[PDB]
Amino acid sequence: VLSEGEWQLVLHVWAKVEADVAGHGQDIHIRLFKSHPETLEKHDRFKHLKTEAEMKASEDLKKHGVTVLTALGAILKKKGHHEAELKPLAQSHATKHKIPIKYLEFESEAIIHVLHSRHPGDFGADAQGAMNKALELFRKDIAAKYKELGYQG
Numbered sequence: 001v002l003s004e005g006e007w008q009l010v011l012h013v014w015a016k017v018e019a020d021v022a023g024h025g026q027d028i029h030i031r032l033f034k035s036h037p038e039t040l041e042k043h044d045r046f047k048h049l050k051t052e053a054e055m056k057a058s059e060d061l062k063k064h065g066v067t068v069l070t071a072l073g074a075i076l077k078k079k080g081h082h083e084a085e086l087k088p089l090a091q092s093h094a095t096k097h098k099i100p101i102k103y104l105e106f107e108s109e110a111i112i113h114v115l116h117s118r119h120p121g122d123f124g125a126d127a128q129g130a131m132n133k134a135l136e137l138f139r140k141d142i143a144a145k146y147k148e149l150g151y152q153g
């Protein structure tokens with residue numbers, strides 16, 4: 001469980017993400033695909049983006065990052081009360097996209113990296129710990145929904 005103060009730290013840095021959702025999403029995916037190359041293999045339409053400049057220029061990838069971060073931000077703003085928002089994401093990611101929970105951990109690492117790179121002054125130790133707890137809760141709850149649907153993530 002997160003305290004209310006921890007949720008406030010999560011939502012304080014998230015407001016900074018919201019000043020440029022597209023750019024944060026690009027940086028997150030570029031970091032994810034470089035750090036854990038197996039993850040790019042899940043994205044059929046991004047595999048031909050073979051250099052960083054191609055990834056940054058891709059409208060398709062840019063729009064995808066906004067879709068991802070918007071869903072995550074909506075979940076974070078529920079402060080744990082997120083079953084209704086989480087279920088469709090578990091449904092598609094378990095049954096259509098086939099994303100292991102470990103890949104959600106990889107994406108979480110990239111999120112934390114970009115947040116700290118862009119906002120170090122608003123992403124100190126307490127805020128990092130809060131975001132780690134929030135993203136763990138998200139992943140734990142997704143993992144339970146995966147199993148309820150019959151998918152071992």
Ligand code: HEM
Nearest residue numbers: 039040042043067068071072089092093097099103104107
């Ligand atoms: C914070 C974690 C994540 C969130 C919030 C998230 C959210 C979303 C959302 C909202 C969509 C569009 C609707 C849907 O199909 O569900 C989506 C699509 C998708 N996601 Fe995720 N996602 C996450 C992590 C991942 C990871 C780690 C991968 C793969 C390595 C992945 C692969 C996909 C794919 C392949 C699609 C379909 C994209 C398309 O064809 O346009 N996602 N995601």
Ligand SMILES: [O-][O-]
Nearest residue numbers: 043064067068
């Ligand atoms: O990728 O969601």
Ligand SMILES: [Cl-]
Nearest residue numbers: 075076079080
């Ligand atoms: Cl939440």
